[PDB]
Design an enzyme around this catalytic site. Structure first.
Site, PDB file in Angstrom:
ATOM      1  N   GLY B  44     -24.946  36.852 -13.147  1.00 41.73           N
ATOM      2  CA  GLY B  44     -25.949  35.806 -13.362  1.00 41.73           C
ATOM      3  C   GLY B  44     -26.808  35.540 -12.134  1.00 41.73           C
ATOM      4  N   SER B  45     -28.018  35.030 -12.350  1.00 46.93           N
ATOM      5  CA  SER B  45     -28.834  34.533 -11.233  1.00 46.93           C
ATOM      6  C   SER B  45     -28.272  33.210 -10.729  1.00 46.93           C
ATOM      7  CB  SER B  45     -30.290  34.358 -11.642  1.00 46.93           C
ATOM      8  OG  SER B  45     -30.922  35.618 -11.661  1.00 46.93           O
ATOM      9  N   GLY B  46     -28.709  32.813  -9.529  1.00 47.65           N
ATOM     10  CA  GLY B  46     -28.318  31.538  -8.931  1.00 47.65           C
ATOM     11  C   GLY B  46     -27.133  31.631  -7.982  1.00 47.65           C
ATOM     12  N   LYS B  95     -17.153  41.022 -11.179  1.00 48.25           N
ATOM     13  CA  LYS B  95     -16.490  39.731 -11.064  1.00 48.25           C
ATOM     14  C   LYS B  95     -15.916  39.370 -12.404  1.00 48.25           C
ATOM     15  CE  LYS B  95     -20.159  37.661  -9.497  1.00 48.25           C
ATOM     16  NZ  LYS B  95     -21.127  38.754  -9.226  1.00 48.25           N
ATOM     17  N   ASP B 100     -19.309  39.349 -18.086  1.00 51.47           N
ATOM     18  CA  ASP B 100     -19.475  40.458 -17.144  1.00 51.47           C
ATOM     19  C   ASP B 100     -18.562  41.600 -17.524  1.00 51.47           C
ATOM     20  OD1 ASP B 100     -20.624  38.090 -15.705  1.00 51.47           O
ATOM     21  OD2 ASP B 100     -20.740  39.501 -13.999  1.00 51.47           O
ATOM     22  N   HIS B 202     -20.095  28.624 -11.289  1.00 50.14           N
ATOM     23  CA  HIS B 202     -21.012  28.269 -12.366  1.00 50.14           C
ATOM     24  C   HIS B 202     -20.816  26.824 -12.805  1.00 50.14           C
ATOM     25  CE1 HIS B 202     -20.291  32.748 -13.265  1.00 50.14           C
ATOM     26  NE2 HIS B 202     -21.333  32.640 -12.460  1.00 50.14           N
TER      27      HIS B 202
END
Lengths: 340, 340
Positions: B44-46, B95, B100, B202
């Site tokens: 994921g982004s961020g 990860k 994922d 997250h």
């Protein structure tokens, strides 16, 4: 006690730095380095890595931390400078805050009088506000890092005290910055989707508060204000070490213009996610080439901070081939590391 | 929209990277680099700079961004791996999040069947919570970064795919992380002086909400939770490329113990001032010394973030001479740069 702990943390994390006591200051572990100009800065804490993360080969020889947002006391500056002197003189880099100005001035004078060859570069890159809370003239912000690197490289190459000082002063005349905050550090109060436009790094008020519409529109006004406030005439004090006295010089900055080549620094003021800084840089490159400015090098990250403030700043520094060679030169510090 | 801008910014800021379109992914500009195992990760982004800031010599060969917090789709993984394959095979670092795991498994089987030599390493270093929101087993957090570096260095030196994979897996069995948050990114809510203990990157919930007394006391309980939760047995799935199928392996982690040497990572989850991270480091070294762990190397800063979350995490990784040599080996990326 929290400050002492963080400084101990720094010293333990970086055995290439030395932490001194009574008075507290930080030097390269191998200082004094014989045969080179020594570089020294300092200022209020809560701007990390500035300045302690900048200590190392090709940058600073030492730094004097003060308390939060307050200047280092002049004993630190004096003791630090005598530690790092390598026989070629010490160059003191001072951001334009009245406290920093008083203190570095005191130290400089005593330093000359004790046999140390010394002079000074005053940084005043913030275009937003003349005569802020803690400043006469313009505040000193992220451009200090760019100058510290470029003069660091000059000193490391073997340039003399005068040549490094002239470089520093010339660079100060060609660098321009501005910053914004979406929320204060932990100091002042904003409405939702409102920003402080032209904020200081010590939480000083900006040009005004105004609405926040988008990232792109903000970068646009920031870039426009760089060009609009680019032009500036003011008097700066420098130590003349041949006469042994303060020498007032008048200087003028030209705004950036079409055809100029620049180093760009997109700087996290503390709580802006990195991903957003790259969006900022996307917009900044577009504006620069619409304006005929070539960005030759960039830094994107957290280089000159204001504790945990949400906001960022943009710095553009006019350069040429000689300055790029100095940019590309090796640097080995906690915050910046490249080259052999 | 905003994502595309950030990635274009990344590409403009780093001419040594190439941004591909249809589908979107990032590789070293000279990929495929022949004659070395290629390393690929994504998520994921961020979490910037994770993973695009780690693309470069001595580290990742490319990376696949997803949307915010969501995993990248298998088309990005498959095309990226194909782009970076230098004929020694591709190693996929994953990860442990259910999205994922699923997407990377799909891409993997398909890669195998298209002629690419390939295998996998799963990161499950977060000691705080079994079976979180988006995970079966333990979450994958900051230790990914240390594994990417060390395995990156082994690939660069010329080690075979199998050797890089085994190294990856072994390191995964020896690393331990935990994180805390004093404020959520912009997802959840804390009273004043309250923390989320054992938070995910997250914003998954931690072990509990508990009082924040002081910085030192927080690190103490973090360090203690590394020891208490240190022990862990579970089953992981790896691609066996010689048989061409998934292969389940039971593995156990020992907790850290007296006599161990470790690499420590103190990681800003996005809005913790660097000054506070050094305080953390100070307390961490004291605690390590008392427990008879030697910290041989460290990283301090924002390496695995969760947008603008207020908190930090600690990762300790058990190492020895061979691993320290890989640590010291050169690395040339946006986020990590050292050596010749």
């Amino acid at each position: 006690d929290v400050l002492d702990e963080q400084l101990a943390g720094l010293a333990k994390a970086h055995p290439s730095l030395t932490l001194h006591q009574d008075p507290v200051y930080v030097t390269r572990a191998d200082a004094p380095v014989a045969g080179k100009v020594a570089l020294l800065s300092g200022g209020g804490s809560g701007a990390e890595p500035m300045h302690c993360g900048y200590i190392g080969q090709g940058m600073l020889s030492g730094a004097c931390p003060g308390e939060i947002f307050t200047s280092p006391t002049p004993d630190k500056i004096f003791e630090c400078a005598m530690q790092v002197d390598g026989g070629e003189g010490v160059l003191l880099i001072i951001k334009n805050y009245t406290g920093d100005i008083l203190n570095f001035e005191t130290a400089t004078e005593l330093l000359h009088d004790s046999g140390v060859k010394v002079t000074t570069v005053v940084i005043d890159d913030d275009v937003a506000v003349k005569d802020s809370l803690y400043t006469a003239g313009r505040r000193g912000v992220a451009n200090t890092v760019l100058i510290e690197k470029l003069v660091g490289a000059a000193a490391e190459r073997g340039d003399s005290l005068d040549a490094c000082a002239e470089l520093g002063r010339k660079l100060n005349n060609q660098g321009h910055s501005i910053g914004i905050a979406l929320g204060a550090c932990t100091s002042f109060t904003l409405a939702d989707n409102e920003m402080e436009f032209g904020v200081g790094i010590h939480g000083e008020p900006g040009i005004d508060r105004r609405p926040f519409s988008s990232l792109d529109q903000t970068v646009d006004e920031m870039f426009d204000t760089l060009l609009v406030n680019g032009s500036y005439h003011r008097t700066l004090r420098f130590w003349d070490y041949q006469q042994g006295s303060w020498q007032e010089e008048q200087q003028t900055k030209q705004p950036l213009q079409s055809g100029d080549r620049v180093i760009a620094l997109v700087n996290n003021l503390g709580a802006t996610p990195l991903s957003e800084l790259y969006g900022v840089y996307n917009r900044l490159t577009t504006r620069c080439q619409q304006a005929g400015l070539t960005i030759e090098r960039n830094l994107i990250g957290a280089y000159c901070t204001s504790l945990d403030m949400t906001g960022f700043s943009i710095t553009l520094l006019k350069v040429d081939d000689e300055t790029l060679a100095l940019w590309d030169a090796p640097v080995h510090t906690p915050a910046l590391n490249w080259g052999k």
